[PDB]
Amino acid sequence: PKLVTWMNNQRVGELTKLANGAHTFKYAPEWLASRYARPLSLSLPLQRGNITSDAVFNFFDNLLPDSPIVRDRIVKRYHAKSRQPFDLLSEIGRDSVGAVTLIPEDLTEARLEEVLTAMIREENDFRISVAGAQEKTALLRIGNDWCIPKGITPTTHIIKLPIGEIRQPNATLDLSQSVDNEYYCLLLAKELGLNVPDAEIIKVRALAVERFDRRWNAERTVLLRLPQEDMCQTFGLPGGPGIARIMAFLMGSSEALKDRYDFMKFQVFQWLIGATDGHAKNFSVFIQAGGSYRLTPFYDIISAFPVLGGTGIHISDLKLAMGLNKKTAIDKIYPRHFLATAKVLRFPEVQMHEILSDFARMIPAALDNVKTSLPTDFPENVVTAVESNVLRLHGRLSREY
């Protein structure tokens, strides 16, 4: 069967699930001729046929919650036929990241504390992540007030709840303050001139994060959805693109030199704050008219510093998701490794120094300005863990800049 794919009430094409379950996609010819025309994904170029590549299934799989458990709930709740994208999306495929809406071929402080109400890993991999669907909820709000949409009508915010405690075989990660954590890290990033979304803590104590793939009407009358996709979708994937593939890609951005500078800069930021979740899945581009693209703001940023020590883990356990140089251990990594990487990438040595130098200069006052602007409510263990472990790696920049 078929799902008609829309982007902002404009018709893009159709997704077909064939008899053997294969997913295929075909652009409408009034899409390929609109002034709005762009690919649905850079992995699905504008073209004329039925597209039958794995890129199609992946694309649409990448729109759904990663977790096989959040997938069961949707299955149970909406009586879905399976956990295949077509089947799960014929049920929840209205609001998703970026702009695509899929159609079958045919509120109250206490209900809130209420609306947000729902772990064990097999793997020894120190997953410290705020990108999970299992804590999220897209609300809508321009007033003073939260409210559930419904219909075809976009959300403005993603609300994140605490992760809580996580047990893998060999460690227990306490992420019960992941809300305060992400909040800190997002202000830090802003202080250091990284583009990141605006967030507030709301109160249960959750993160309200303003969506950067939503924008009001010029006439200010309709929330539009901005096309964007993540790097998994971009590359046709469910391995995993590192710094080199992404940096190559970003040479084609419409803001190539800025996006390439920011992206490298962000590898240094994640090193400094102990962020170990910067997988491909976690960077995104805006798709623009014509299928040109720009990096979005960076998002879903959490330090692993607050889970170091005690019931928690060691610093020698923290690995960058995308390594340098090959080099992944955050506590073995010095300015020199960033420069070896910039060199291998034919990213200008001078731009790498500039980045390393501004962090040298700026880290102390950024940390201090962030500290000043925290709520009075804020958990001091969180600040103390991040600040102290940041200043420590930063002193590796001083020994140098």
Cβ neighbors of 327 (< 8 A, separation 6 or more) are 320, 333, 337
Q: Which of 180, 230, 259, 277 is catalytic?
A: 277
> Which of the stretches 36-44, 123-131, 142-150, 307-315 binds another protein when contact is defined by CB under 8 A?
36-44
**Minimum distance from CB of 328 to Cl ion (Å)?**
5
Size of the site for another protein (CB under 8 A): 33
Q: Is residue 277 annotated as part of the catalytic site, yes or no?
A: yes
Interface with another protein, residue 225, by CB under 8 A: yes
**Exposure of 8 in the CB half-sphere (CA atoms within 13 A):** 19
Interface with Cl ion, residue 242, by CB under 5 A: yes
Q: How many residues are present in the chain? A: 401
Q: Which does 246 bind (CB under 5 to 8 A by kind): Hg ion, another protein, Cl ion, none?
A: none
Q: Which does 254 bind (CB under 5 to 8 A by kind): another protein, Cl ion, Hg ion, none?
A: another protein
Residue of the chain from 32, 142, 148, 365 that contacts another protein (CB under 8 A): 32
Kindly give the pairing relationship between strand 327-329 and strand 199-202: unpaired
Q: Pattern of binders to another protein over 54-73, x per CB under 8 A?
A: --------------------
Interface with another protein, residue 46, by CB under 8 A: yes
**Minimum distance from CB of 333 to another protein (Å)?**
22
**Chain-centroid distance, C-alpha 213:** 12
- Pick between residue 62 and residue 303 the one whose CB is nearest to Hg ion: 62
- Pick between residue 48 and residue 203 the one whose CB is nearest to another protein: 48
Q: According to CB under 8 A, which residues from 192 to 211 bind another protein?
A: none
Question: In Å, how far are 152, 228, 369 from 96, measured between CA atoms?
Answer: 11, 10, 35
Hey, what long-range contacts does 30-37 have (CB within 8 A, 24 or more apart)? 34/10, 35/289, 36/7, 36/10, 36/289, 37/289, 37/290
Dihedral pair phi/psi, residue 339, rounded to 5°: -60, -45
**Minimum distance from CB of 76 to another protein (Å)?**
35
Q: According to CB under 5 A, which residues from 83 to 142 bind Hg ion?
A: 141
**Minimum distance from CB of 241 to Cl ion (Å)?**
6
Q: Are 29 and 15 in contact (CB under 8 A)?
A: no
Residue of the chain from 19, 110, 118, 350 that contacts another protein (CB under 8 A): 350
Q: Are 302 and 128 in contact (CB under 8 A)?
A: yes
**Minimum distance from CB of 231 to another protein (Å)?**
15
Dihedral pair phi/psi, residue 290, rounded to 5°: 80, -10
- Cα–Cα distance between 284 and 28 in angstroms, integer? 25
Residue of the chain from 1, 104, 238, 252 that contacts another protein (CB under 8 A): 252
* Cα 273-276-280 angle, rounded to 5 deg: 120
Interface with Hg ion, residue 256, by CB under 5 A: no
Give me 280's structure tokens: 């491909």
Q: Which does 329 bind (CB under 5 to 8 A by kind): Cl ion, another protein, Hg ion, none?
A: Cl ion
> Which residues carry a binding-site annotation for ATP?
131-136, 160, 210-212, 279-282, 299-300
Interface with Cl ion, residue 204, by CB under 5 A: no
**Minimum distance from CB of 216 to another protein (Å)?**
10
Q: Which does 171 bind (CB under 5 to 8 A by kind): Hg ion, another protein, Cl ion, none?
A: none
What does the binding site for Hg ion look like in residue numbers (CB under 5 A)?
141, 143, 145, 147, 232, 237, 240, 280
What does the binding site for Cl ion look like in residue numbers (CB under 5 A)?
242, 244-245, 327-329
Please list the active-site residues.
277
What does the binding site for another protein look like in residue numbers (CB under 8 A)?
8, 32, 35-36, 39, 42, 45-48, 99, 215, 217-218, 224-227, 251-254, 256-257, 289-292, 345-348, 350
